[PDB]
Write a protein that binds this ligand. Structure first.
Ligand code: HEM
Length: 129
């Protein structure tokens, strides 16, 4: 929606915010020693991962459906099956996503709206242990 209601994308500040969110996420993943397990299973060059997550989040939050346009149906559990994701990879991903959100999305109510379903998805991507 845009006029009396608005989308989450609109609400958090749209493209500049999703850009900052996704950038800060991979930065924390690359620089925090506590995120080393999650970092270990990602590609040595994070550039392509960032592009895809940014496109995924853009569509997911009510912005333009750019991820689907390029890659088709998300099918995330299947796409994540190629990485070995145990509790550690899972909680370290959630560590970085939480901190990236807290730092880039000012509105607490919008962070709560986004977080609960993402944390559900993360537990659902876990494929080990
Ligand atoms: C358990 C937590 C998670 C871990 C450890 C994890 C890890 C990974 C890894 C290793 C990749 C492959 C990177 C690449 O191809 O460059 C990936 C891709 C991706 N992840 Fe996750 N992920 C997790 C949860 C999530 C969640 C909850 C979402 C959605 C909010 C998500 C969205 C994506 C997307 C859109 C891709 C690109 C898929 C594609 O290849 O088209 N991930 N993730």
């Amino acid at each position: 929606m845009s006029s009396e209601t608005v989308t989450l994308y609109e609400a958090i500040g749209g493209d500049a915010t999703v850009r900052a969110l996704t950038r800060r996420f991979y930065e924390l993943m690359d620089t925090l020693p506590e995120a080393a397990r999650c970092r270990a299973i990602h590609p040595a060059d994070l550039s392509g991962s960032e592009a895809k997550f940014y496109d995924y989040l853009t569509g997911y939050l009510g912005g333009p459906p750019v991820y689907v346009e390029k890659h088709g149906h998300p099918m995330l559990r299947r796409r994540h099956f190629v990485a070995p994701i145990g509790p550690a990879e899972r909680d370290e991903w959630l560590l970085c996503f939480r901190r990236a959100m807290d730092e880039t999305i000012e509105n607490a109510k919008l962070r709560e709206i986004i977080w609960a379903p993402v944390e559900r998805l993360a537990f659902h991507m876990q494929n080990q242990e």
